[PDB]
Amino acid sequence: DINGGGATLPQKLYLTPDVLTAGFAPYIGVGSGKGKIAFLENKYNQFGTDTTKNVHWAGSDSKLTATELATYAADKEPGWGKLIQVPSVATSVAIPFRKAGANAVDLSVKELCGVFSGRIADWSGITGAGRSGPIQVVYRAESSGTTELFTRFLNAKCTTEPGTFAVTTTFANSYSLGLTPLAGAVAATGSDGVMAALNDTTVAEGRITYMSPDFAAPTLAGLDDATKVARVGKGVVNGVAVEGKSPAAANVSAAISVVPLPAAADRGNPDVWVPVFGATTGGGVVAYPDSGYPILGFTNLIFSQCYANATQTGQVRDFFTKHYGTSANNDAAIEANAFVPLPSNWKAAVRASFLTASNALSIGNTNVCNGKGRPQ
């Protein structure tokens, strides 16, 4: 079997029957940090105790770092082939909370920033929410791609707090002044662990967090309940008050559709395949959108170009053919789990590099993978 795991943000998608195709073992959700280690170092111990198994792929919503890429290129690539890093689906980052009230909770970006910096410690500081009492932040204890996607937004947009947020996979390391300004912030492990803490009725109401939209509510409809999942984007544009949007996929799809393709000449560099958002467009960075739901990003796949086993090679190719297909694809399942399919031009680009047999980057390319590949 082909073994993968990593990011919890999309784990329920990858666990849905037939999203992963023949040969793929059930996906093991353990966090993006562990997913990257598992793949880069071939350490199945990050997935489970049966370390006779080899790792074949990972899900991650944390980008591979310069050091990770360079180390793999030097240590593993000569014998195993190039790694491949590609977007899987696009996603919002939802803000679920436990605080009763008939009023819609609609955070301005400034309010969001204050909640997560500690500047706003009481629900009464959220205009229009009709709520009062302490806010308690729940965050991911471990190295998390959800944290990376969220802190990338805070870094770009929270520009008038006392401190600043660094982009990181460890939330406790993000704010320059630390977590100390927050009173009783709670760390939990996994998307599921954070939601369990958020939903814990043995403690007082008031908790809030950042979350995969597939976990942030029991069903898609729940993402539109602003008494449980915050709208984000409240403000004033051209002199007129505007409401924020829910993190429903429909509210980020327009922004995703116009994300530029990875620069053609550099498509041999895995770093260019994962777009990141930022304050302004330029140098490969895509500006966070001024319309729709504001907090978005990509979750990604990490594979090898080459596998020692020919059956596994074909099975990986069959998965790419489905996941990036023009038709007979995973898009209905992607949408059903609160995510945004990749645009057609993105699917085509992924296929043209990693599937089309003649391409030097293609999975199982006979000239490149001659005598090479990750162990079965």
Residue numbers in the entry: 1 to 376
Give the authors' words.
DING is a family of proteins with molecular mass of approximately 40 kDa, with a conserved N-terminal sequence of DINGGG. DING proteins are one of three families within a superfamily of bacterial phosphate-binding proteins. To date, the crystal structures of two DING proteins, i.e. human phosphate-binding protein (HPBP) and DING protein from Pseudomonas fluorescens SBW25 (PflDING), have been reported. In both structures, a phosphate ion was captured in a binding cleft between two domains.
To enable further study of DING proteins, an E. coli expression system for HPBP was constructed. Then, the insoluble rHPBP was unfolded with 6 M guanidinium hydrochloride and 1 mM β-mercapto­ethanol. The chemically unfolded rHPBP was refolded by the dilution method. The refolded rHPBP was further purified by chromatography, and the final yield was 43 mg per litre of culture. To evaluate whether rHPBP was refolded correctly, the purified rHPBP was crystallized and its structure was determined. The structure of rHPBP was determined at a resolution of 1.03 Å. The revealed structure was well superposed on the native HPBP with r.m.s.d. of 0.04 Å for 327 Cα atoms. A phosphate ion was captured at the identical site to native HPBP, with identical residues participating in recognition. Furthermore, two disulfide bonds were formed correctly. Based on these observations, it was concluded that rHPBP was correctly refolded to the native structure.
